[PDB]
Design a protein around this motif. Structure first.
Motif, mmCIF file in Angstrom:
data_model
loop_
_atom_site.group_PDB
_atom_site.id
_atom_site.type_symbol
_atom_site.label_atom_id
_atom_site.label_comp_id
_atom_site.label_asym_id
_atom_site.label_seq_id
_atom_site.Cartn_x
_atom_site.Cartn_y
_atom_site.Cartn_z
ATOM 1 N N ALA A 47 -16.501 -24.632 -6.664
ATOM 2 C CA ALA A 47 -16.897 -24.532 -5.269
ATOM 3 C C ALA A 47 -15.719 -24.705 -4.321
ATOM 4 O O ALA A 47 -15.870 -24.471 -3.119
ATOM 5 C CB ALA A 47 -17.977 -25.565 -4.944
ATOM 6 N N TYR A 48 -14.560 -25.120 -4.829
ATOM 7 C CA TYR A 48 -13.332 -25.200 -4.050
ATOM 8 C C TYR A 48 -12.411 -24.015 -4.278
ATOM 9 O O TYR A 48 -11.254 -24.061 -3.846
ATOM 10 C CB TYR A 48 -12.574 -26.484 -4.377
ATOM 11 C CG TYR A 48 -13.110 -27.721 -3.718
ATOM 12 C CD1 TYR A 48 -12.620 -28.144 -2.490
ATOM 13 C CD2 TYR A 48 -14.120 -28.451 -4.310
ATOM 14 C CE1 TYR A 48 -13.111 -29.284 -1.886
ATOM 15 C CE2 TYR A 48 -14.620 -29.585 -3.718
ATOM 16 C CZ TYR A 48 -14.117 -29.992 -2.505
ATOM 17 O OH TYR A 48 -14.620 -31.129 -1.931
ATOM 18 N N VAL A 79 -18.833 -28.041 -10.439
ATOM 19 C CA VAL A 79 -19.290 -27.596 -9.125
ATOM 20 C C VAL A 79 -18.257 -27.947 -8.060
ATOM 21 O O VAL A 79 -17.949 -27.127 -7.183
ATOM 22 C CB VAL A 79 -20.677 -28.186 -8.807
ATOM 23 C CG1 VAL A 79 -21.066 -27.934 -7.361
ATOM 24 C CG2 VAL A 79 -21.720 -27.572 -9.719
ATOM 25 N N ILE A 80 -17.633 -29.123 -8.164
ATOM 26 C CA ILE A 80 -16.615 -29.451 -7.164
ATOM 27 C C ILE A 80 -15.222 -29.063 -7.650
ATOM 28 O O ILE A 80 -14.217 -29.624 -7.202
ATOM 29 C CB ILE A 80 -16.666 -30.929 -6.731
ATOM 30 C CG1 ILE A 80 -16.421 -31.884 -7.897
ATOM 31 C CG2 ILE A 80 -17.993 -31.237 -6.066
ATOM 32 C CD1 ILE A 80 -16.174 -33.315 -7.482
ATOM 33 N N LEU A 115 -19.827 -30.628 1.747
ATOM 34 C CA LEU A 115 -18.610 -29.826 1.703
ATOM 35 C C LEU A 115 -18.854 -28.327 1.803
ATOM 36 O O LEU A 115 -17.922 -27.598 2.165
ATOM 37 C CB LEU A 115 -17.806 -30.118 0.428
ATOM 38 C CG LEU A 115 -16.803 -31.279 0.484
ATOM 39 C CD1 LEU A 115 -15.804 -31.065 1.616
ATOM 40 C CD2 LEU A 115 -17.418 -32.678 0.535
ATOM 41 N N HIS A 116 -20.051 -27.835 1.471
ATOM 42 C CA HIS A 116 -20.465 -26.529 1.970
ATOM 43 C C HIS A 116 -20.517 -26.538 3.488
ATOM 44 O O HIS A 116 -20.029 -25.610 4.142
ATOM 45 C CB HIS A 116 -21.833 -26.144 1.412
ATOM 46 C CG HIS A 116 -21.821 -25.760 -0.031
ATOM 47 N ND1 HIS A 116 -22.978 -25.595 -0.759
ATOM 48 C CD2 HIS A 116 -20.801 -25.487 -0.877
ATOM 49 C CE1 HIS A 116 -22.671 -25.251 -1.996
ATOM 50 N NE2 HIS A 116 -21.356 -25.175 -2.093
ATOM 51 N N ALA A 161 -26.082 -25.101 -5.117
ATOM 52 C CA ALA A 161 -24.631 -25.166 -5.110
ATOM 53 C C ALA A 161 -23.998 -23.785 -5.099
ATOM 54 O O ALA A 161 -22.858 -23.640 -4.648
ATOM 55 C CB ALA A 161 -24.131 -25.950 -6.320
ATOM 56 N N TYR A 168 -21.819 -31.994 -2.424
ATOM 57 C CA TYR A 168 -21.279 -30.666 -2.151
ATOM 58 C C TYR A 168 -21.921 -30.030 -0.930
ATOM 59 O O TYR A 168 -21.301 -29.171 -0.294
ATOM 60 C CB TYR A 168 -21.430 -29.760 -3.376
ATOM 61 C CG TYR A 168 -22.835 -29.623 -3.925
ATOM 62 C CD1 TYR A 168 -23.265 -30.419 -4.976
ATOM 63 C CD2 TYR A 168 -23.723 -28.695 -3.403
ATOM 64 C CE1 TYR A 168 -24.539 -30.291 -5.490
ATOM 65 C CE2 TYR A 168 -24.993 -28.572 -3.901
ATOM 66 C CZ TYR A 168 -25.395 -29.369 -4.943
ATOM 67 O OH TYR A 168 -26.663 -29.235 -5.440
#
Lengths: 574, 552, 575
Positions: C510-511, C506-507, C457-458, C399, C454
């Motif tokens: 990661a945004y 992480v979400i 979404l990466h 991640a 994710y």
């Protein structure tokens, strides 16, 4: 079914599916099985791979439980249903289904694909998982084949004779003998073990006294005499001890039923006829012990002070080891049934007499059981039944005041074999009992010669026969019309005189409710009941103008797209 | 009556055809529910008249079991008079009430053929509570051994021929009697009667007799119903307690740390079909405790005659021709230790069950359930103080280990102020007889039994006030039972409702002492370790009755 | 027969393999070699079932069929075998002398086919039974080689009866030998899984009535095998058998019996065994306050117990110390207070501190390389929990960096496979110890699904959010249906909530560059779901102050929008 997936034409394969999902699931619990490749796996594999479904969960367990082959198919049809109302659908069988999913997941050279499917099922739901199982219900109670019987032994190192159990391997051996894919040395050497306990349980009933060979006639002429009491005694007595008696009795039953199975295996058939026939002519002389011993329901009112010997195994389990034990499926053993029942017919009709033997000896005592299998479930049992009474009617054909005494049992049993047996059952059952009903009905009517003899058994037999010309499933109704035609020729009187006793006990359920209720089976039963009435010379000519307007209105009602129903809609059933 | 009505007809049938039999305006109310119940769904009504009518008709038992239960009622009431409080028992004889009762009982039997043989054994007046009692033990033994040699599996087609032909009388899908009792809100998943099996069994009870009919349902489930032709008219009270302890079970199931160990009362169903005949699912092969006692004693050389014979002639041996009487109590300890020592030893029921289950695994998970629900049983005895527990009144299940009871009867007058029921239980608070203690643990007896018996109380006092709103009416009908039992009952006056409220506070207070850890560091359950400290002590078990059977 | 110039390797190396042969005449010739060369006295053969056969027969097949040969080959030539526990069927003789009244009395009219018939039975049945012991044995042996469920049911019935002649002066030798056979025959028996393995020789000990007094650790080490419920026989029997003498045997039996109950992790047969075993009262108060769910007052009462400890009173049985500190750690871990015991996990308890990795943080990037210096030094003797951590470190490393390593989906699946090994070690009934494993599976199918979320979404840096990424609504809606049940245990609830919050963070982080371009509206703020929900289920067990203090991580990004304020004030007020 194994040759199309992704095909679009199966929206025409919708008119037929519950009418086959019934007609697979009302047999797949009950076919048992054949020589064990792909036998119930076939029907399970049909019910899984087909395209509202409370049906499909019942065979779905059998894939996961017994079969190492249908595993991935039942798992792949177990995932795809996973909304909200699924939990009442699997609800009865969860403690089975979630038991079977615990059996699969295991590390071995066992598969690494289906176990991860199991982990994926058990992880895609996490809250649907364990809130359905409670502390466990089904436990093991040292049941049928589990009891011991501690016979004596002698071991060379010890002084005193140590008692130890004689029957460890009576589950495993009986599991070997049925098992088909097996070497013959282990199966033959399982028959050499398994019957030896059966011989141990009769060992202290194989000694016969010093003056015995004439004493059976002293027993037989004792039957024809009145006022047999006994000495007035005031002694205490041991008691029943129920669920050790039932375990030893059903155990003994499984031994000699395993002899009856062991006939239909090659290089064992001759030996099993030796031991089997020797048991059957052994187990007929004990039946007179059952006669005069249980003559003590009579010969005085009570005389409560009796002897009543010590509560042993009655040897009335031959009554439950010909009929129940040879309703079997391999059916080379059914030859051993007809051979068996002929042999006990000759010995029972040999030592005891030939006209009184049908009064107190073994033949009514087991013909009652052949009546009883005609009311059973499980079409195998009925096929045992009608065959058993056809060996009855061809040996008690001539020498019989018997069959006129026990007629109304026989016509009821042979009419109930017809009356409810499912459609998917093989149709060599319901057309080998109608003919047999006409064989017996031809035998027990060969001397009524006028229109007056309707005394008791004539009256109940004719009332029984003609008052059931409705119900449903018209093998029975056409069986009844064929019966009334075939006993209106042996001293042929008109049908109306064969109905005049019961002509009023047949129409009041027809004219009682008008129609347009009580669904279709008995509705067609009433109308095709009045097929047979008006097709005769002189009966039934008035007051049915309501019936004609209601049936005629029951077809001028164009049944598509209106109220052609009472409760169930056309969109539901098809 | 208009939408559901199969959830009505079983009880409406018997209360209509009891109030309209033994008897104004109420049975004209009860005709309306049956008439409007008859207009909508007629074939349901007639199709239930087939079952009620034929089950009433063909199960009128026999002409030997009326004599069997007659004998055994005469014995269980005979020793009840022989030790009730007749005398100090100086060579007794029968009082005149007995001879009036059983001279009167000759018409209760069948007419023809008992009467010379039974009337030839008490009119001779040689009954002196030695010929009478031992005579009845002879008649019970010969009659019981007569009911061995009868058939164990009567065929249904010859017993009741209509109920075998029932399933081809195929319409409207009769639901199974006995499933509208527990709730299961959705009401669209009941099992319907597919067909009635043949081979109706035949159970020789120790004190009565009954058959059971077993039904196959359309889902493929086979489950039975014990049919019993004489049901004594205090069955209704046993039903209403069966309406109570199932009623707690929803909000008791919803609670955390009850549900973690899932105590779930598991008290049986009972539906009526008659003013005298109820059927209820005594399913296949689960027994009492008293049958285990008979199996052990006749498995030994003795019989249960010799115990009450032993304490009877030892007890009156300590009175006749020599009367020390240090007390009853210190004598009852001595005869009690003689019974435990020389007869009926320790761990007899444990030696029953560890020799009854193969694969000891299956035994262990037995008693981990058996210690739980017995806990949920003992609470059901301690709340709403019922009665002694004779060990043929409790039923252990042999598959899972469940426990239930017949005889749920809540009964004093030693305080004629505050007259009605729900006063004390005599000398031990409940039943924790040592031959179920040796099976119950001494580790599950505290780690499972005690923490359950606390967990139920604090699980019931604080959902919110449920014990008050249930026990208002469910104690009120016991008040109306207390007035209507005697020929008193005409005092329905506004003392009634506070007269309910004082017993309501007596029970809700009564379930509190075992219910809260108050302020200090106690161990916990100290009212439970106290009350089971009393319920196991042989000084306290010695003074209680002999039909209660504190030795087993 | 006596020529010892050949080495005796092969009377051991293929010879005891000579019954694996799956050929009839081969096997019968080998066993007639053995049984026609040994002794006959059954005690001095029951020695040479246990004293001899030094071949391990490593992990293959139940070798006690050959044992039942070495003792079944010493019975006798008895030709009756009088069965004596069944009350046999109705007699021919005695039933036919029950009529003295009416003298029918047929006088020798034996001139029929009955003259042919009746005598034919007496000549038959006198010879039709004739059952000898040896012929009865020799058709039972071939039941064994087809199926291994009869060797058990013959050994359980046999072995406590040949033992009935093992007199004293040879007692401790047989006990001392059978100890060396159950546990250490210099051999680890991974003989099968879940089937008949050692239970034959482990059930039968319980049927002995007390040969088993010394060892007690042999009786515990056989738990890596099957026989969970089969040795509790052996340990619970002494409490109904012991005396006041030699109490160290008794409390030894109770304490390793207790940690058999720890392995099965049912607790109701654990607290009772303490409080009927213990010495100080404060264990009874403390453990009795645990089992209701009131861990704070048990925490306080244990704190009262240590200051009463190490004094001139009873010696606290040298294991209530570990009970007080281990339950001190447990009662800590139930409510809250993850922050407190961190430095106690530093001075001791290396394997503890990886369970203390939820220190009100959800990033781990300050010590992302400082944990696997401990994780890679704890994965000796792996468990699915520690393997779950080692899967989580690569699960977060994938991640952090785009496209990572993708090592997880062949690192997780052995994570499943170890938990299935522990599943097969446990018995077949639904123990509550299986319970955690089900939640374990419920996290593994959340790890691999993590490698779908994710990573979708990466890869979706395509900048088409809130119009394409409806997979968040679908599969995050699917995260709200594996709820688990409201009565399971508090530890696994806080486990599921906090580690799902690691996925939520992480979400969120990661945004972090995706934020300023728009702020239709995307912003997640659905950490309030597990916080209001975990507040409700953290009320329903016990402890209202915890679900008060578990409405403390709610004052981040506003958490106000749809229904979060509704059940926020509902649960916070109604608490």
């Amino acid at each position: 079914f194994r040759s199309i997936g992704g095909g679009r034409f199966e929206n025409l394969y919708r008119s037929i599916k519950p009418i086959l999902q019934v007609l697979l699931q009302s047999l797949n619990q009950m076919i048992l099985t054949a020589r064990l490749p792909h036998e119930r796996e076939l029907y399970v594999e049909l019910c899984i791979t087909v395209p509202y479904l409370p049906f499909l969960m019942k065979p779905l367990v059998f894939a996961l439980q017994q079969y190492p082959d249908l595993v991935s198919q039942g798992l792949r049809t177990l995932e795809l249903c996973i909304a909200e109302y699924f939990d009442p659908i699997i609800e009865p069988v969860i403690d089975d289904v979630s038991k079977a999913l615990f059996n699969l997941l295991q590390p071995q050279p066992f598969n690494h694909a289906i176990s991860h499917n199991v982990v994926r099922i058990l992880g895609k739901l996490g809250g649907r998982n364990r809130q359905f199982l409670k502390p466990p219900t089904d436990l093991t109670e040292k049941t049928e084949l589990d009891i011991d019987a501690i016979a004596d032994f002698k071991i060379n190192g010890m002084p005193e004779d140590v008692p130890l159990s004689v029957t460890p391997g009576i589950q495993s051996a009986l599991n070997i003998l049925q098992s088909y894919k097996s070497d013959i040395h282990y199966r033959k050497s399982a028959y050499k073990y398994l019957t030896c306990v059966l011989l141990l349980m009769t060992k202290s009933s194989a000694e016969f006294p010093t003056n015995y060979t004439e004493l059976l006639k002293t027993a037989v002429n004792s039957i024809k005499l009145e006022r047999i009491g006994i000495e007035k005694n005031f002694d205490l007595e041991p008691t029943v001890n129920k669920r050790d008696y039932s375990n030893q009795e059903n155990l003994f039953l499984r031994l000699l039923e395993s002899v009856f199975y062991a006939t239909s295996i090659k290089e064992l058939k001759d030996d099993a006829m030796d031991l089997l026939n020797n048991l059957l002519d052994h187990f007929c002389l004990l039946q007179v012990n059952t006669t005069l011993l249980n003559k003590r329901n009579y010969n005085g009112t009570f005389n409560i002070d009796l002897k009543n010997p010590n509560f042993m195994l009655d040897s009335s389990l031959i009554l439950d080891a010909i009929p129940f034990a040879l309703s079997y499926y391999i059916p080379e053993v059914r030859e051993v049934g007809v051979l068996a029942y002929k042999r006990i017919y000759e010995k029972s009709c040999l030592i005891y007499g030939e006209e009184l033997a049908l009064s107190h000896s073994f033949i009514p005592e087991l013909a009652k059981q052949f009546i009883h299998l005609c009311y059973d479930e499980t079409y195998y049992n009925k096929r045992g039944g009608v065959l058993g009474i056809k060996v009855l009617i061809d040996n008690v054909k001539s020498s019989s005041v018997f069959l006129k005494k026990y007629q109304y049992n026989l016509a009821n049993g042979l009419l109930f074999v017809l009356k409810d047996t499912q459609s998917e059952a093989p149709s060599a059952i319901t057309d080998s009992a109608e003919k047999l009903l006409i064989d017996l009905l031809s035998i027990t009517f060969a001397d009524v010669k006028e229109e007056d003899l309707g005394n008791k058994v004539l009256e109940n037999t004719l009332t029984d026969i003609v008052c059931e010309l409705s119900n449903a499933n018209p093998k029975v109704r056409n069986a009844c019309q064929k019966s009334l035609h075939t006993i209106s020729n042996l001293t042929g009187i008109p049908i109306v005189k064969l109905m005049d006793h019961s002509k009023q006990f047949l129409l009041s359920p027809i004219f009682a409710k008008p129609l347009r209720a009580l669904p279709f089976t008995m509705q067609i039963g009433n109308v095709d009941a009045i097929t047979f009435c008006l097709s005769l010379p002189n009966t039934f000519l008035t007051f049915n103008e309501e019936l004609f307007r209601l049936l005629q209105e029951s077809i001028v009602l164009a049944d598509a797209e209106d109220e052609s129903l009472s409760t169930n809609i056309q969109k539901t059933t098809e | 009556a208009k939408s559901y009505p199969q959830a009505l007809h079983f009880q409406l049938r018997t209360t209509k055809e009891d109030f309209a039999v033994i008897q104004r305006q109420p049975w004209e109310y009860l005709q309306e529910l049956n008439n409007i119940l008859k207009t909508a769904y007629p074939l349901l009504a007639l199709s239930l008249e087939s079952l009620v009518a034929q089950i009433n008709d063909r199960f009128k038992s026999t002409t030997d079991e009326d004599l069997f239960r007659l004998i055994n009622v005469l014995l269980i009431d005979g020793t009840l008079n022989y030790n009730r409080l007749p005398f100090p028992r100086k060579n007794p004889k029968l009082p005149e009430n007995t001879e009036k009762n059983l001279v009167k009982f000759s018409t209760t039997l069948l007419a023809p053929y008992i009467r010379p043989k039974f009337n030839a054994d008490f009119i001779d007046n040689k009954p002196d509570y030695e010929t009478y009692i031992k005579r009845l033990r002879y008649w019970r033994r010969r009659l019981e051994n007569k009911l061995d040699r009868a058939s164990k599996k009567e065929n249904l087609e010859v017993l009741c021929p209509h109920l075998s032909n029932f399933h081809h009388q195929k319409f409207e899908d009769i639901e199974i009697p006995g499933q509208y009792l527990l709730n299961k809100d959705n009401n669209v998943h009941f099992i319907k009667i597919a067909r009635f099996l043949p081979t109706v069994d035949f159970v020789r009870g120790t004190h009565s007799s009954y058959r059971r009919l077993m039904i196959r349902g359309h889902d493929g489930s086979v489950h039975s119903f014990a049919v019993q032709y004489p049901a004594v008219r205090h069955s209704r009270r046993e039903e209403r307690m069966f309406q109570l302890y199932r009623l707690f079970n929803k909000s008791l199931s919803k609670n955390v740390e009850t549900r973690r160990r899932s105590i779930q009362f598991n008290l049986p169903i009972a539906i009526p079909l008659s003013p005298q005949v109820r059927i209820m699912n005594d399913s296949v092969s689960f027994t009492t405790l008293h049958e285990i006692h008979n199996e052990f004693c006749k498995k030994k050389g003795f019989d249960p005659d010799d115990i009450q014979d032993f304490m009877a002639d030892k007890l009156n041996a300590a009175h006749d021709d020599a009367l020390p009487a240090p007390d009853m109590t210190i004598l009852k300890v001595e005869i009690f230790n003689s019974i435990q020592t020389m007869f009926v030893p320790s761990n007899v029921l444990k030696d029953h069950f560890t020799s009854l289950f193969t694969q000891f695994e299956d035994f262990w998970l037995f008693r981990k359930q058996f210690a739980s629900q017995y806990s949920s049983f003992v609470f059901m005895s301690y709340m709403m103080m019922i009665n002694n527990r004779t060990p043929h009144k409790i039923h252990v299940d042999k598959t899972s280990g469940n426990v239930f009871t017949l005889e749920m009867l809540p009964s004093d007058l030693s305080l004629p102020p505050d007259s009605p029921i729900f006063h004390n239980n005599e000398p031990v608070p409940f039943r924790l007889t040592p031959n179920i203690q040796s099976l119950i643990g001494d580790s599950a007896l505290e780690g499972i039994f005690a923490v359950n018996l606390f967990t139920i109380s604090r699980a019931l006092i604080e959902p919110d006030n449920e014990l008050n709103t249930y026990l208002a009416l469910f104690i009120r009908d016991e008040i109306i039972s207390w007035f209507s039992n005697l020929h008193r009952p005409i005092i329905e006056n506004p003392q009634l409702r506070e007269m309910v409220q004082t017993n309501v506070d007596l029970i809700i207070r009564k379930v509190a002492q075992l219910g809260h850890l108050n302020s200090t560091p106690t161990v916990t359950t100290q009212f439970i370790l106290d009350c089971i400290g009393s319920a196991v002590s042989p000084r306290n078990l010695a003074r209680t009755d002999v039909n209660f059977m504190p030795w087993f | 027969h006596f020529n010892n110039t050949e080495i005796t390797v092969r009377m051991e190396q293929p010879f005891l393999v000579g019954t694996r042969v799956e050929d009839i005449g081969i096997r019968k010739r080998f066993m007639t070699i053995l049984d026609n060369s040994l002794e006959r006295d059954i005690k001095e053969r029951l020695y040479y079932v246990i004293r001899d056969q030094n071949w391990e027969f490593i992990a293959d097949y139940p070798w006690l069929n050959q044992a039942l040969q070495l003792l079944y080959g010493s019975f006798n030539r008895e030709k009756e075998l009088s069965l004596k526990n069944i009350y046999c069927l109705s007699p021919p003789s005695i039933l036919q002398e029950y009529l003295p009244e009416n003298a029918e009395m047929v006088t020798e009219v034996n001139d029929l086919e009955l003259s042919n018939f009746v005598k034919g039975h007496i000549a038959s049945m006198q010879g039709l039974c004739r059952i000898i012991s040896s012929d009865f044995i020799d058709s039972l042996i071939e039941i064994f080689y087809q199926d291994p469920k009869a060797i058990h049911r013959a050994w359980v019935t046999l072995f406590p009866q040949v033992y009935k002649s093992i007199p004293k002066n040879e007692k401790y030798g047989f006990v001392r030998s059978i100890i060396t056979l159950l546990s250490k025959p210099y051999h680890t028996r991974q003989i099968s899984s879940r089937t008949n393995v050692i239970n034959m020789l482990l059930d039968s000990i319980s049927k002995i009535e007390s040969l088993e007094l010394p060892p007690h650790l042999v009786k515990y080490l056989a738990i890596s095998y099957n026989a969970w419920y089969q040795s509790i026989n052996i340990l619970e029997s002494i409490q109904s058998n012991t005396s006041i003498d030699n109490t160290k045997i008794i409390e030894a039996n109770e304490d390793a019996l207790l940690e058999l109950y720890v392995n099965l992790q049912e607790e109701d047969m654990f607290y009772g065994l303490w409080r009927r075993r213990a010495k100080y009262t404060e264990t009874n108060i403390g453990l009795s306050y645990e089992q209701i769910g009131l861990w704070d007052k048990a925490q306080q009462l244990y704190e009262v117990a240590q200051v009463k400890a190490r004094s001139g009173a009873l010696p606290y049985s040298q294991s209530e110390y570990a009970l007080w500190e281990d339950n001190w750690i447990q009662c800590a871990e139930k409510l809250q207070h993850w922050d407190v015991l961190t430095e106690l996990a530093k001075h001791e308890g290396f394997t503890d501190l990886l369970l203390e990795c939820g220190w009100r943080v959800a990033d781990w990037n300050s010590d992302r390389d400082a944990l696997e210096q401990s994780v890679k030094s704890v994965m000796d003797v792996p468990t699915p929990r520690r393997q779950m951590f080692k899967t989580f470190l690569a699960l977060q490393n994938f991640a952090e960096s785009r496209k990572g390593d993708q090592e997880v989906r062949k690192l997780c699946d052995e994570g499943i496979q170890l938990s299935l090994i522990k599943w097969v070690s446990l018995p077949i009934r639904y123990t509550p110890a299986h319970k955690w494993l089900l939640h374990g599976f419920q996290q593994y199918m959340e790890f691999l699904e993590a490698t779908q979320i994710y990573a979708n979404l990466h890869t979706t840096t395509v900048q088409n959010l809130d119009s394409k990424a409806q997979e968040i609504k679908r599969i995050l809606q699917a995260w709200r249906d594996r709820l688990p049940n409201t009565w399971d245990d508090v530890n696994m609830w806080n486990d599921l909530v906090t580690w799902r919050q690691h996925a939520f963070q992480v979400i969120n982080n990661a945004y972090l560059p995706l934020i300023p371009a728009l702020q239709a509206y995307r912003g997640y703020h659905e950490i309030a779901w597990v916080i209001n929900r975990f507040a409700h289920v953290a009320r329903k067990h016990n402890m209202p102050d915890v679900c008060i203090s578990q409405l403390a991580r709610i004052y981040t990004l506003p958490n106000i929008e749809i229904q979060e304020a509704f059940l926020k004030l509902r649960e916070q007020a109604k608490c």
